[PDB]
Amino acid sequence: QPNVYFDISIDNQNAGRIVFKLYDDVVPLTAKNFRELAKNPAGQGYTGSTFHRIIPQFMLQGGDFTNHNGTGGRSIYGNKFKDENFQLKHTKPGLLSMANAGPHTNGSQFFITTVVTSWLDGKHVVFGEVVEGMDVVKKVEAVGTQSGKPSKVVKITASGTV
Ligand SMILES: [K+]
Ligand code: NA
Ligand code: NA
Ligand code: NA
């Protein structure tokens, strides 16, 4: 199954492309959900949504494509799907992990780590890593703030598989 890309704008200016390799062999349903949400048309997935919460030296969070503020989103399976396993750990920057509201509540929201976050191990499912565009991840992280409210709008202007 192919890698996933997001094209990113910051303050409505193109900032480049992030490409992710997903760990389908280990968390196939978690990988499948993020890949189909990336392929979907605007309004039905990541295309046209924002990184609504960004905290430097911690992570960039996105995937709320229904409310744009952290209260929304839904997986391709419905509102919530299970934690498949916690075999992969938050061992390095640039990992994709699911946000949730406790055990077995994954939806569409995810975050990309920018530091080692090993205190999340066993509570958030890691399912992929950035393989191109850590430069772009840096630039998005630079508009984060103490409150997590981005100081410039960061949009996924296109997404799909490459
Ligand atoms: K798309
Ligand atoms: Na933008
Ligand atoms: Na989409
Ligand atoms: Na979002």
Ligand code: NA
């Ligand atoms: Na790169």
